[PDB]
């Protein structure tokens, strides 16, 4: 059981390394 792609869509869009840069 692994679903790393669904979790990485919302994490990378909102945060974007710092805060939406």
């Amino acid at each position: 059981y692994d679903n790393i792609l669904v979790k990485m869509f919302k994490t990378n869009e909102n945060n974007d390394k710092s805060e939406l840069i």
Side-chain angles (χ1 to χ4, degrees), residues 3-15:
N3 289 286
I4 196 163
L5 192 65
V6 82
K7 306 301 181 71
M8 297 319 182
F9 292 137
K10 299 100 178 179
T11 305
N12 193 267
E13 186 63 81
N14 290 291
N15 198 75

